[PDB]
Design a protein around this ligand. Structure first.
Ligand code: MG
Ligand code: MG
Ligand code: MG
Ligand code: MG
Lengths: 22, 561, 214, 546
């Protein structure tokens, strides 16, 4: 008989940065 | 282990013991009152406080069946097997006598379903939820949980029926630490010279897992001392040296002076060697600061009898290189409270809100490991007049200043955190942080006077050998406008000329200790290039600001009732 | 606030959802000028995250929702940075100015702060109140704390003498006489006149108003 | 590799040695004293110091079983497999005799839980926590770790019972480097002339593998110079001279500073003319603390660190910086003026603190802050972004140069053109002690400059430079260089003309008096008299303060 298997690795996120003007 | 091993938290001990033992020994009271006891416990607190010890003590104490489940022990690669393991565990636990199930490190099994993105974790959380409280809920089975973070737990698990009661296993107080020391130093061969009360007083932020480390490394120091010369035999040890094994007070002092609280392990400040005798002049400032930092810690009973909270903050302003940072170093060296040192912009980050996160983290660590002395060097970087940043860097500086305000004075537990600020441009600091309650006393550190300069010279030349016929009074009188940095420069230049003469004389001697100390001519030649560091316009600004403070202060002097 | 994208507004939505779930609820927004600033000022921003945050606050405090009795209280000392939309009635309708205490208010504050402290029988606070003119509650607290510190110092030295061979059962007149020579006013006339100008501009908004009959 | 192979760090070696060996050798003492030994170590420090080497040494020497765990090798994709790997490793280790486990590069496995987005990393962190601390945690099993970023570890992991003591395996001292050289040079055949003590004294920031690289490079240089000279007996004549080691040392640099290495420019003390007093004062200030620390510790004082050159442009301050970088033993860190700045928030200060951290780590070091007019300026500018970052940078400079640090022989060398615009807190003693003014050279100074510039070039035997030196009275070293360049250009033009004429049909192997006369008729005198007035005013104000 056959069998299944589960797998959950990761994803991709988004960051936000702050800048300084002059 | 046993019931006496866990010391420092008797209240939590009794709270757990109630539902762990009484409904198992004599349920007649509960059947009389008509209400069933709680059947869910969640122990949370900082690491090393004693959660796993409490679980082990319960296991050793109760005659009931015990089942321990580690956090990631349940997960398997097959789809639908983690929940099968959980079901098998719970059915085995329930099939036996009234049992106890201990789930360690629940932050791994049971995260919030809404924030996670996988599928097996959600399914495991749902299985756990239905096992804990569903149709045919439970039968005299009590579940205990331990975690370091309760906020990262599914809200459905923080409910009555699943985890009704949450005990907070927190940092011990002085008496609790004394109990921990007594418990951890009851089986070793101690010396007669040990007063555990002094140790429990001087240890401040130790969570109880650091007491064991301190005791063990102190014992290792003692054995090292008695091994280095008395018996260095790789083959066998004679019994005589074993009987002379007493961990002494000097060993405990060494162990305390080396170790630090586990919480502040990251932020340990590298040791610098400054002393109250190293800091010349500023005697009034020295005594005032010593009182402000020692009275609330040494004499809490007095403050509690007087029903008033101590003054905490203090700011130093004055011309540069006058002794502000030196006083900070001396405090960090010879005060008995923990020290947290940060430079001015050291806690800034490009990410959005990360500076605010860093500030919150350092102040939470400071109140957690209290009493704690936080030194904020060069406030002008992180705390400026809000709203004046017309050129916008995103306005993050305003957010930083607001966070500082409402972290030094907001919705808090009023723990012992003292804030020393040091700046050389007070006019650029926001008025909302110079208020009492945050930075109460504003101390002007002025330029030295004649006696102050003489004392500074004596302090700086405390260890350097000097000519017997040398006198520093003329040097102190000659300057009339110098600062401590300038006097240090004069001393260093004299040293430079002395070392030059010594090196050239030794070279000549080898070619075919002539100078054992600095001399009058060395000082005369090092004083030829002496210069003032601070001009008068900067001194004019400082005196004008101080006079403004005096105007804010001079209305009273002394009054009549 | 959070470094990620949208997590600030997610947190705000979660907090307000909890507030309206466990109603009636009281929500205290300390230093509203930190998160709710006037929009468009930032020339260089983190993708306009502050603007998105203030818009989220606006929509949640007044939008397509119900009135489940949730009371927002703001406490800020810089009302010039707050966006006008937030200060609209129906969002934050009551602007309460908390001025500096008067003579009877300084006396009340001193008595409130000395309600759990032993005091000299003959000591009166009317002189201290009459003598602090521009002071604030924090300044009066500082005076009290300095007096307590001097009392504790005297107690400690007395106990040291006792061990060498209550001496200070309660605070005396001298601990205030010696503790109020260093007291100072926290708020200067510049900030005082700024807040007075703000109050008077709001009053000027109430133009041509008197005891009028309909 | 045994314990003898490891060298340069004695305290840490003893710390791991006693814990790993004595409990397994004589547990009678622990039974007598009634305390169990610590069972956890986290070795940290900069990369390439010998952490893995010490682990290998203790593994190879102790008779206890050794199990090796790598950082990413245990991770997987399936749900619940990395934790299974850790459980298998720990149970296999505990099944046998008392054993040692080594989790290399633990910082990859176990970052802070709160600041991660995945889930498998959190589970494996929790698995490590439960394995090391828990009900019936360990029995005669010792755990050792190695990492480079201790602060990026879960604080729950840095507690007693998991990692009892964090030993700092840092860079070695001069003696430590001596033993490192002696250890590494034990198998290769060396020549008698070279003495390793001088090499150890000369090297300052080299750590471990840096010395290994030095030895390997010296051997390779010796082989390459002999292999090209020649086309059994060759093996006998295999010896590495002191010249090979000198070559390798000159061509090398410590790993921590390799990215900050400066392009080699050849300048020497004789290549800078005039300024003898300033040159001698700088030499004293620099090599006194590093060559003779015994005298300084005998007198119990610290040495002056900072220096600032100011004056007209081109007079030779950057030339002195080059000369120092070439002719001092301490490491050099050059930086342009605004080179450290950045557009992001809180990054220009991070830049400053990183360079200072590297400098004080690889001490002694000379940091040359060039063009302070940009970084320093004057704190308290014209409000808004005109000062918003210019003040934060200055405050970071102040608190890094002086305050809450350990004195570790870091000499800041400044160079400016309008020092009146510098923040007064920077100029304070203890930050920039020496305020050296580098004036326009006088007649004899100009003569010295000319002789220095004309050191390596053919000259006519009957040629004198006194007339050239005296006929300027207002020039600078740059202007004299310009005169020399024009003279050389005219001479080489004449040479090319002669060569072309000879080809069509060494003619001039030296520069001539007429060449100098023709080149000198168009001179510059670049520095204006207003700049000289300003500099004289500033200098006399300084002297009046003096
Ligand atoms: Mg535990
Ligand atoms: Mg300072
Ligand atoms: Mg390695
Ligand atoms: Mg230059």
């Amino acid at each position: 008989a056959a069998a299944a298997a589960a797998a959950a690795a990761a994803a991709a996120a988004v960051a936000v940065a702050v800048a300084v003007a002059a | 282990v046993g019931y006496d091993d866990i010391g420092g938290c008797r209240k939590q001990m009794a709270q757990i013991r109630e539902m762990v033992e009484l409904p198992l020994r004599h349920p007649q009271l509960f059947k009389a009152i008509g209400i069933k006891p709680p059947r869910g416990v969640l122990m949370y607190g900082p690491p090393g406080t004693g959660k796993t010890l409490m679980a082990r003590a319960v296991a050793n104490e109760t005659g009931a069946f015990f089942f321990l489940i580690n956090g990631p022990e349940v997960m398997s690669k097959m789809a639908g097997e983690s929940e099968s393991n959980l079901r098998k565990a719970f059915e085995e636990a329930e099939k036996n006598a009234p049992a106890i199930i201990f789930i360690d490190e629940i932050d791994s099994i049971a995260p919030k379903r809404d924030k996670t993105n996988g599928e097996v974790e959600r399914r495991v959380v749902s299985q756990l939820l239905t096992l804990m409280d569903g149709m045919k809920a439970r039968s005299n089975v009590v579940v205990i949980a331990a975690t370091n973070r309760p906020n990262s737990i599914d809200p459905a698990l923080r409910r009555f029926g699943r985890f009704d009661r949450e005990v907070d296993i927190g940092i011990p107080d002085a008496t609790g630490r004394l109990e921990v020391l007594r418990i951890h130093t009851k089986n070793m061969k101690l010396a007669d010279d040990v007063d555990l009360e002094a140790l429990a007083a001087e240890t401040h932020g130790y969570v109880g897992a650091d007491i064991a480390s301190l005791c063990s490394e102190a014992a290792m120091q003692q054995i090292r001392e008695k091994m280095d010369l008395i018996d260095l035999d790789e083959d066998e040890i004679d019994a005589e040296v074993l009987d002379s094994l007493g961990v002494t007070m000097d060993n405990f002092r060494f162990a305390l002076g080396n170790s630090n609280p586990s919480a502040l392990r990251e932020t340990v400040v590298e040791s610098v060697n400054v002393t109250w005798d190293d800091v010349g002049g500023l005697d009034e400032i020295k005594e005032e600061l010593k009182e402000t930092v020692e009275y609330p810690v040494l004499h809490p009973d007095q403050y509690t009898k007087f029903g008033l909270s101590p003054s905490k903050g203090v700011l130093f302003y004055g011309p540069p290189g006058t002794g502000k940072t030196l006083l900070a170093k001396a405090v960090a060296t010879e005060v008995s409270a923990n020290f947290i040192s940060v430079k001015g912009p050291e806690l800034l980050s490009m990410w959005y809100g990360e500076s605010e996160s860093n500030i919150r983290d350092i102040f939470d660590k400071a109140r957690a490991a209290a009493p704690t002395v936080v030194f904020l060097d060069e406030l002008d970087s992180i705390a400026k007049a809000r709203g004046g940043s017309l050129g916008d860097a995103g306005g993050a500086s305003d957010r930083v200043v607001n966070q500082l305000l409402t972290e030094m004075d907001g919705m808090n537990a009023k723990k012992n955190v003292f804030v020393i600020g040091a700046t050389n441009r007070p006019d650029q600091i926001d008025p909302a942080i110079l208020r009492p309650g945050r930075l109460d006393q504003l101390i002007y550190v002025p330029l030295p006077d004649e006696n102050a300069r003489l004392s500074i010279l004596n302090a700086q030349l405390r260890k350097t050998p000097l000519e017997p016929g040398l006198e520093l009074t003329a040097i102190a009188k000659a300057t009339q406008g110098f600062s401590g940095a300038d006097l240090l420069y004069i001393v260093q230049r004299a040293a430079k000329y002395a070392i030059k003469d010594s090196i050239e004389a030794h070279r000549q001697h080898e070619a075919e200790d002539p100078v054992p100390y600095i001399t009058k001519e060395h000082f005369a030649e090092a004083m030829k290039t002496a210069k003032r560091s601070v001009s008068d316009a900067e001194l004019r600004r400082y005196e004008a600001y101080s006079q403004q403070m005096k105007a804010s202060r001079g209305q009273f002097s002394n009054f009549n009732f």
